[PDB]
Amino acid sequence: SISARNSLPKVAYATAMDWFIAVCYAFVFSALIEFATVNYFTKRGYAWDG
Amino acid sequence: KVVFSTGSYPRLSLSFKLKRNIGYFILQTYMPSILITILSWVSFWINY
Amino acid sequence: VEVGDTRSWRLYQFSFVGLRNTTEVVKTTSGDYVVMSVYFDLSRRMGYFTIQTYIPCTLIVVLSWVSFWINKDAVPARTSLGITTVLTMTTLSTIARKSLPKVSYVTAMDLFVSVCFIFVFSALVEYGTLHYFVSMDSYARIFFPTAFCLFNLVYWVSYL
Ligand SMILES: *[C@@H]1O[C@H](CO)[C@@H](O[C@@H]2O[C@H](CO)[C@@H](O[C@@H]3O[C@H](CO)[C@@H](O)[C@H](O)[C@@H]3O)[C@H](O)[C@H]2NC(C)=O)[C@H](O)[C@H]1NC(C)=O
């Protein structure tokens, strides 16, 4: 998001590339919240073995 | 007066004694380095 | 003074508010001269830095606050989250300073960066203190989002 904006001038509105990067950031952050909920609902701390 | 090989020439010189301001560097180099060396001392309290 | 359409103007982050013309007599070594001045009132628009440094840093310090939802026995996970947050807070402090010139005094953007940095550093030392105690997580689970929420009401009202 930083290295995509510097090719543009310092305009005061959001372009379509910014609206792509924002939604992609929302999905990545939602994957983080997904892991947060999964880790909160984790009981035993070991894993599994054959 | 300065002296060259062609003769002696008059000279005026205007000079300034600039002093650098410490405030920018003390928050963008010195303080990050101090806090980063603070962060390394967190390791000494963690279990081995 | 005749301005134009005020839209072909390449003023991007600013916006011409108005103009005022004045005249005065200055005194120099040679003599007194009539000086004519035109003042151009320009007011800035932050929409650019919101996506440059504000939102970006706010989402990093939101990612700082999810460490509390991770269990206390997962030590390398939470310390990896901590070290990544603090190194990227330093990185975003460095990057946002490139747009600013080399001035000595502090700005409101630098004050926001410093408040976010001390917030994430407080989060890391709180997790560290919890780890040394078990060898208050829920207590922070409310306090650390709320302290930034009251800060943003303090920060934006006082500067706007
Ligand atoms: C910045 O640097 C310059 C150059 O180093 C400094 O200029 C120097 O100033 C001193 C005194 O102001 C000069 O000394 C003079 O020497 C003559 C010799 O006959 C003497 O008659 C005078 O009474 C005086 O003592 C020195 O010559 C001069 N350097 C040069 C190369 O001309 C300057 O002071 C420094 N600081 C500032 C704030 O500019």
Swiss-Prot record, chain A:
TM region positions: 16-37
Highest taxon of the lineage: Eukaryota
Extracellular topological segments: 6-15
Record's subcellular location: Postsynaptic cell membrane; Cell membrane; Cytoplasmic vesicle membrane
Extra remark beyond the main annotation: Functions as a receptor for diazepines and various anesthetics, such as pentobarbital; these are bound at a separate allosteric effector binding site.
Domain characteristics, as noted in the entry: The extracellular domain contributes to synaptic contact formation. The GABA-binding pockets are located at the interface between neighboring alpha and beta subunits.
Sequence similarity: Belongs to the ligand-gated ion channel (TC 1.A.9) family. Gamma-aminobutyric acid receptor (TC 1.A.9.5) subfamily. GABRA1 sub-subfamily.
Subunit-structure text: Heteropentamer, formed by a combination of alpha (GABRA1-6), beta (GABRB1-3), gamma (GABRG1-3), delta (GABRD), epsilon (GABRE), rho (GABRR1-3), pi (GABRP) and theta (GABRQ) subunits, each subunit exhibiting distinct physiological and pharmacological properties. Interacts with UBQLN1. Interacts with TRAK1. Interacts with KIF21B. Identified in a complex of 720 kDa composed of LHFPL4, NLGN2, GABRA1, GABRB2, GABRG2 and GABRB3. Interacts with LHFPL4. Interacts with NLGN2. Interacts with SHISA7; interaction leads regulation of GABAAR trafficking, channel deactivation kinetics and pharmacology.
Clinical note on disease: Epilepsy, childhood absence 4: A subtype of idiopathic generalized epilepsy characterized by an onset at age 6-7 years, frequent absence seizures (several per day) and bilateral, synchronous, symmetric 3-Hz spike waves on EEG. Tonic-clonic seizures often develop in adolescence. Absence seizures may either remit or persist into adulthood.
Protein name: Gamma-aminobutyric acid receptor subunit alpha-1
Species of provenance: Homo sapiens (Human)
Gene that this sequence comes from: GABRA1
Swiss-Prot record, chain B:
Domain of life from the UniProt record: Eukaryota
Transmembrane feature ranges: 22-42
Topological domains annotated Cytoplasmic: 43-48
Tissue: Isoform 1 and isoform 2 show reduced expression in schizophrenic brain. Isoform 3 shows increased expression in schizophrenic and bipolar disorder brains while isoform 4 shows reduced expression.
Binding site for histamine: T6
Coiled coil regions in record: none
Impact upon substituting Y24H: In IECEE2; uncertain significance
Subcellular location: Postsynaptic cell membrane; Cell membrane; Cytoplasmic vesicle membrane
Chain residues that bind 4-aminobutanoate: T6
Function field: Beta subunit of the heteropentameric ligand-gated chloride channel gated by gamma-aminobutyric acid (GABA), a major inhibitory neurotransmitter in the brain. GABA-gated chloride channels, also named GABA(A) receptors (GABAAR), consist of five subunits arranged around a central pore and contain GABA active binding site(s) located at the alpha and beta subunit interface(s). When activated by GABA, GABAARs selectively allow the flow of chloride anions across the cell membrane down their electrochemical gradient.
Assembly notes: Heteropentamer, formed by a combination of alpha (GABRA1-6), beta (GABRB1-3), gamma (GABRG1-3), delta (GABRD), epsilon (GABRE), rho (GABRR1-3), pi (GABRP) and theta (GABRQ) chains, each subunit exhibiting distinct physiological and pharmacological properties. Interacts with UBQLN1. May interact with KIF21B. Identified in a complex of 720 kDa composed of LHFPL4, NLGN2, GABRA1, GABRB2, GABRG2 and GABRB3.
Domain notes: The extracellular domain contributes to synaptic contact formation. GABAARs subunits share a common topological structure: a peptide sequence made up of a long extracellular N-terminal, four transmembrane domains, intracellular or cytoplasmic domain located between the third and the fourth transmembrane domains.
Protein name as annotated: Gamma-aminobutyric acid receptor subunit beta-2
Organism: Homo sapiens
Gene behind the chain: GABRB2
Swiss-Prot record, chain C:
Post-translational modification, as annotated: Palmitoylated by ZDHHC3/GODZ; required for the accumulation of GABA(A) receptors at the postsynaptic membrane of inhibitory GABAergic synapses.
Membrane-spanning residues: 50-70, 77-96, 109-133, 139-159
Sites where a glycan is attached: N21
Cytoplasmic topology ranges: 71-76
Outcome recorded upon mutating R97Q: In GEFSP3 and DEE74; does not affect protein abundance; decreases cell surface expression; decreases current amplitude in response to GABA; increases zinc sensitivity; accelerates deactivation
The organism's place on the tree of life at top rank: Eukaryota
Phenotype upon changing Y48C: Found in a patient with generalized epilepsy with myoclonic atonic seizures, cognitive impairment and behavioral disorder; likely pathogenic
Subcellular location: Postsynaptic cell membrane; Cell membrane; Cell projection, Dendrite; Cytoplasmic vesicle membrane
Extracellular side: 97-108
Disease per record: Developmental and epileptic encephalopathy 74: A form of epileptic encephalopathy, a heterogeneous group of severe early-onset epilepsies characterized by refractory seizures, neurodevelopmental impairment, and poor prognosis. Development is normal prior to seizure onset, after which cognitive and motor delays become apparent. DEE74 is an autosomal dominant form with onset in the first year of life.
Family: Belongs to the ligand-gated ion channel (TC 1.A.9) family. Gamma-aminobutyric acid receptor (TC 1.A.9.5) subfamily. GABRG2 sub-subfamily.
Domain notes: The extracellular domain contributes to synaptic contact formation. GABAARs subunits share a common topological structure: a peptide sequence made up of a long extracellular N-terminal, four transmembrane domains, intracellular or cytoplasmic domain located between the third and the fourth transmembrane domains.
Name of the protein in its database record: Gamma-aminobutyric acid receptor subunit gamma-2
Organism: Homo sapiens (Human)
